[PDB]
Ligand SMILES: Cc1cc(-c2ccccc2)cc(C(=O)NNS(=O)(=O)c2cccc(O)c2)c1F
């Protein structure tokens with residue numbers, strides 16, 4: 001029941017965690033997947049036959065973002081059950097804490113792709129509850145291993161907060177995050193308020209106004225302000241310490257940025 | 268609408284003066 005590798009597009013990937021693929025498939029230790037419809041197969045011969053006839057060239061759902069070669073597709077788990085189940089089983093090979101794979105109907109899946117000389121390739125995704133009463137704007141979030149640590153994850157995170165902004169909600173990723181996902185959110189949260197603070201020249205700020213603009217949860221903002229040693233306390237008032245050390249170090253960084261004007265989507 | 272962080276609690280609505 002342990003899968004060791006998968007064949008995905010032009011990549012062969014070592015898998016990290018158990019995923020409940022049907023035991024008829026799991027016991028072979030290796031899976032061959034169509035990179036477009038996410039069907040999993042037993043042999044590369046079967047895969048080759050499938051790609052020769054597979055009609056899919058991109059995720060289902062509606063393309064709700066496009067800038068250059070980057071797309072985001074909104075996939076309703078109730079309307080594309082099989083695709084989303086295959087997506088969740090694939091994700092479980094690389095996420096330890098994901099627990100839902102088959103009951104995809106409560107979820108929306110936001111799938112990010114890159115178009116290139118071969119095709120329109122899966123970069124990663126995040127799932128999202130259609131009704132989160134705990135204000136999670138992300139359930140699970142992942143980049144494929146061949147695109148990790150290359151700025152794509154930051155785009156995915158930014159897109160999740162872009163949706164929250166349009167919804168006029170504040171949100172947070174559901175916990176526990178993967179190791180890399182927590183590392184990525186902390187770095188993204190730091191960059192976000194450095195841009196806010198660089199673009200802001202009032203002299204007093206509430207957590208609320210930062211949260212309202214960025215859609216970042218107040219808890220995440222304060223812990224980031226403490227992580228950056230910018231949250232100080234003198235007499236009876238809490239202060240924010242503008243380290244231009246950081247706004248300049250951040251200013252030296254720059255494409256892999258989401259363009260809000262390229263979003264065609266309403267709640 | 269408050270945050271507990273260490274060892275006191277903040278209000279989301281209080282203006283925090285920015286300094287150097
Ligand atoms: C949420 C997330 C998850 C996973 C992931 C989790 C489990 C399995 C596989 C992937 C990977 C990434 C990523 O790619 N982070 N690096 S990043 O994009 O360059 C990046 C991200 C943020 C700020 C930066 O300054 C640079 C990510 F953001």
Ligand SMILES: [Zn+2]
Pocket residue numbers: 034035036037038039050051054055056
């Ligand atoms: Zn296919």
